[PDB]
Design a protein around this motif. Structure first.
Motif, PDB file in Angstrom:
ATOM      1  N   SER A   8     -14.422   6.771   0.066  1.00 45.93           N
ATOM      2  CA  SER A   8     -13.210   6.078   0.485  1.00 45.93           C
ATOM      3  C   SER A   8     -13.537   4.663   0.942  1.00 45.93           C
ATOM      4  N   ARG A   9     -13.115   3.681   0.142  1.00 44.23           N
ATOM      5  CA  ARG A   9     -13.400   2.282   0.447  1.00 44.23           C
ATOM      6  C   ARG A   9     -12.894   1.906   1.831  1.00 44.23           C
ATOM      7  N   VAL A  10     -11.704   2.387   2.193  1.00 40.08           N
ATOM      8  CA  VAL A  10     -11.186   2.135   3.532  1.00 40.08           C
ATOM      9  C   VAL A  10     -12.137   2.699   4.576  1.00 40.08           C
ATOM     10  N   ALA A  11     -12.525   3.968   4.426  1.00 35.57           N
ATOM     11  CA  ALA A  11     -13.396   4.601   5.412  1.00 35.57           C
ATOM     12  C   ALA A  11     -14.730   3.875   5.530  1.00 35.57           C
ATOM     13  N   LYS A  12     -15.210   3.281   4.436  1.00 29.51           N
ATOM     14  CA  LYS A  12     -16.459   2.529   4.503  1.00 29.51           C
ATOM     15  C   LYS A  12     -16.261   1.180   5.182  1.00 29.51           C
ATOM     16  N   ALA A  13     -15.081   0.588   5.036  1.00 28.80           N
ATOM     17  CA  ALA A  13     -14.832  -0.720   5.628  1.00 28.80           C
ATOM     18  C   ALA A  13     -14.943  -0.643   7.150  1.00 28.80           C
ATOM     19  N   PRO A  14     -15.560  -1.632   7.804  1.00 29.56           N
ATOM     20  CA  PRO A  14     -15.698  -1.583   9.264  1.00 29.56           C
ATOM     21  C   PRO A  14     -14.575  -2.275  10.025  1.00 29.56           C
ATOM     22  N   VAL A  15     -14.105  -1.647  11.103  1.00 30.18           N
ATOM     23  CA  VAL A  15     -13.064  -2.253  11.925  1.00 30.18           C
ATOM     24  C   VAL A  15     -13.704  -3.033  13.066  1.00 30.18           C
ATOM     25  N   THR A  16     -13.063  -4.129  13.460  1.00 29.55           N
ATOM     26  CA  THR A  16     -13.625  -5.076  14.412  1.00 29.55           C
ATOM     27  C   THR A  16     -12.862  -5.038  15.730  1.00 29.55           C
ATOM     28  N   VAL A  17     -13.593  -4.913  16.830  1.00 33.72           N
ATOM     29  CA  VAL A  17     -12.993  -5.121  18.152  1.00 33.72           C
ATOM     30  C   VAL A  17     -12.879  -6.619  18.412  1.00 33.72           C
ATOM     31  N   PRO A  18     -11.692  -7.139  18.734  1.00 27.35           N
ATOM     32  CA  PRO A  18     -11.586  -8.591  18.969  1.00 27.35           C
ATOM     33  C   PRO A  18     -12.417  -9.074  20.147  1.00 27.35           C
ATOM     34  N   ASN A  19     -12.173  -8.533  21.345  1.00 29.06           N
ATOM     35  CA  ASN A  19     -12.874  -8.918  22.569  1.00 29.06           C
ATOM     36  C   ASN A  19     -12.296  -8.196  23.779  1.00 29.06           C
ATOM     37  N   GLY A  20     -11.022  -8.457  24.086  1.00 28.24           N
ATOM     38  CA  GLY A  20     -10.423  -7.886  25.278  1.00 28.24           C
ATOM     39  C   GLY A  20     -10.157  -6.398  25.173  1.00 28.24           C
ATOM     40  N   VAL A  21     -10.087  -5.872  23.951  1.00 28.53           N
ATOM     41  CA  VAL A  21      -9.794  -4.456  23.772  1.00 28.53           C
ATOM     42  C   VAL A  21     -11.057  -3.644  24.027  1.00 28.53           C
ATOM     43  N   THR A  22     -10.887  -2.455  24.599  1.00 26.99           N
ATOM     44  CA  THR A  22     -11.994  -1.550  24.887  1.00 26.99           C
ATOM     45  C   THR A  22     -11.680  -0.188  24.283  1.00 26.99           C
ATOM     46  N   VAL A  23     -12.534   0.274  23.377  1.00 30.31           N
ATOM     47  CA  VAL A  23     -12.352   1.559  22.714  1.00 30.31           C
ATOM     48  C   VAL A  23     -13.393   2.524  23.264  1.00 30.31           C
ATOM     49  N   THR A  24     -12.926   3.634  23.834  1.00 26.70           N
ATOM     50  CA  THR A  24     -13.802   4.618  24.461  1.00 26.70           C
ATOM     51  C   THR A  24     -13.537   5.979  23.836  1.00 26.70           C
ATOM     52  N   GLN A  25     -14.578   6.589  23.282  1.00 27.42           N
ATOM     53  CA  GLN A  25     -14.447   7.937  22.755  1.00 27.42           C
ATOM     54  C   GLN A  25     -14.753   8.960  23.841  1.00 27.42           C
ATOM     55  N   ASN A  26     -13.883   9.960  23.961  1.00 25.16           N
ATOM     56  CA  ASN A  26     -14.071  11.063  24.896  1.00 25.16           C
ATOM     57  C   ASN A  26     -13.928  12.361  24.099  1.00 25.16           C
ATOM     58  N   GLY A  27     -15.028  12.792  23.494  1.00 29.06           N
ATOM     59  CA  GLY A  27     -14.965  13.945  22.611  1.00 29.06           C
ATOM     60  C   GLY A  27     -14.083  13.642  21.417  1.00 29.06           C
ATOM     61  N   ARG A  28     -13.052  14.466  21.233  1.00 32.77           N
ATOM     62  CA  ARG A  28     -12.110  14.246  20.141  1.00 32.77           C
ATOM     63  C   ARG A  28     -11.141  13.111  20.460  1.00 32.77           C
ATOM     64  N   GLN A  29     -10.846  12.902  21.743  1.00 28.90           N
ATOM     65  CA  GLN A  29      -9.734  12.048  22.166  1.00 28.90           C
ATOM     66  C   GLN A  29     -10.224  10.618  22.404  1.00 28.90           C
ATOM     67  N   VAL A  30     -10.104   9.800  21.355  1.00 31.01           N
ATOM     68  CA  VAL A  30     -10.434   8.386  21.470  1.00 31.01           C
ATOM     69  C   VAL A  30      -9.291   7.661  22.163  1.00 31.01           C
ATOM     70  N   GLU A  31      -9.632   6.715  23.035  1.00 26.23           N
ATOM     71  CA  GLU A  31      -8.656   5.924  23.769  1.00 26.23           C
ATOM     72  C   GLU A  31      -8.921   4.453  23.485  1.00 26.23           C
ATOM     73  N   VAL A  32      -7.853   3.674  23.330  1.00 24.57           N
ATOM     74  CA  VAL A  32      -7.945   2.246  23.051  1.00 24.57           C
ATOM     75  C   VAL A  32      -7.164   1.500  24.126  1.00 24.57           C
ATOM     76  N   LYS A  33      -7.823   0.534  24.764  1.00 23.60           N
ATOM     77  CA  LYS A  33      -7.250  -0.288  25.817  1.00 23.60           C
ATOM     78  C   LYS A  33      -7.151  -1.728  25.336  1.00 23.60           C
ATOM     79  N   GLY A  34      -6.136  -2.431  25.819  1.00 27.39           N
ATOM     80  CA  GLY A  34      -5.955  -3.812  25.443  1.00 27.39           C
ATOM     81  C   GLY A  34      -4.998  -4.515  26.378  1.00 27.39           C
ATOM     82  N   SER A  35      -4.680  -5.761  26.023  1.00 18.70           N
ATOM     83  CA  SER A  35      -3.746  -6.541  26.826  1.00 18.70           C
ATOM     84  C   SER A  35      -2.361  -5.909  26.832  1.00 18.70           C
ATOM     85  N   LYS A  36      -1.916  -5.402  25.681  1.00 20.60           N
ATOM     86  CA  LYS A  36      -0.557  -4.877  25.577  1.00 20.60           C
ATOM     87  C   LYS A  36      -0.411  -3.549  26.310  1.00 20.60           C
ATOM     88  N   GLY A  37      -1.363  -2.641  26.136  1.00 24.28           N
ATOM     89  CA  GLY A  37      -1.269  -1.372  26.831  1.00 24.28           C
ATOM     90  C   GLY A  37      -2.282  -0.369  26.326  1.00 24.28           C
TER      91      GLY A  37
END
Length: 174
Positions: A1-30
């Motif tokens: 899957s070309r999409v699955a191979k493509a890498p996603v980029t964190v801009p800067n202010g956003v924080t992505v934290t994996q907690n087991g299955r439940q990934v959480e994404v934080k940012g300026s908006k919410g």
RNA sequence: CCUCUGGUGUACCGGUUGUGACGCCAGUCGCAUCGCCGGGUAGCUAUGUUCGGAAGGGAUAACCGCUGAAAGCAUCUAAGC
């Protein structure tokens, strides 16, 4: 899957934290939350994130592709967000945002009052235009579809509620 | 269900024919489809009276979607809503 191979980029202010299955994404908006399929693994090295299948299954590649797409959308939403631009056509059709409730007059014998859910904001610079902004792309699309459903475009005049980027089929009687 | 409107209401009231009897007049009673006729209390009853199928939750059918890859696009679907 070309999409699955493509890498996603964190801009800067956003924080992505994996907690087991439940990934959480934080940012300026919410805050946003996304679960992970059993065949999907997420590796966050540097700013980039990699979605790779646990096993070499075709189903695993499929799930990895969707998981990456959802996380990319979540990151883009928390960083910048999305907007919809609904439009109204027809004589007497009007809309107004008052607080968190959108009041619509769409040619019925009664006005319609639509309560926005938490996470979507609306504004009407003009009586016939509605701006919807959100961090959740799916919720924003659901709200736009619900608002559009009240009076859908008809082919003979194009009257009703429409998306700005929407092609309307047209014909005429006889 | 029986307050109202009516029906019935052979143990309620009255008019009246024939005959027999109560010793007789008067007054009554038996029988004649309750003799016939006019009314009618309760009960029962409809054609009479009142009420009901109102409103709201949950999962769905056809159908309409949101986001979304497999399949760099598209896509209501495979994950999710």
């Amino acid at each position: 899957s070309r999409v699955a191979k493509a890498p996603v980029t964190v801009p800067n202010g956003v924080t992505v934290t994996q907690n087991g299955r439940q990934v959480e994404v934080k940012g300026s908006k919410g805050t946003l939350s996304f679960n992970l399929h059993a065949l999907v693994e997420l590796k966050q090295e540097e700013g980039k994130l990699q979605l790779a299948p646990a096993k070499e299954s075709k189903d695993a590649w499929m799930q990895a592709g969707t998981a990456r797409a959802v996380l990319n959308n979540l990151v883009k939403g928390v960083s910048e967000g999305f907007e919809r631009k609904l439009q109204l056509v027809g004589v007497g059709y009007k809309a107004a945002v008052k607080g968190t409730v959108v009041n619509l007059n769409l040619g019925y014998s009664h006005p319609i009052d639509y309560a926005l859910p938490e996470g979507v904001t609306a504004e009407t610079p003009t009586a016939t235009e509605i701006i919807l902004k959100s961090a959740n792309k799916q919720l924003l699309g659901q709200v736009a579809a619900e608002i559009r459903a009240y009076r859908s475009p008809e082919p003979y005049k194009g009257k009703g509620v429409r998306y700005s980027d929407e092609v309307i089929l047209r014909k005429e009687a006889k």
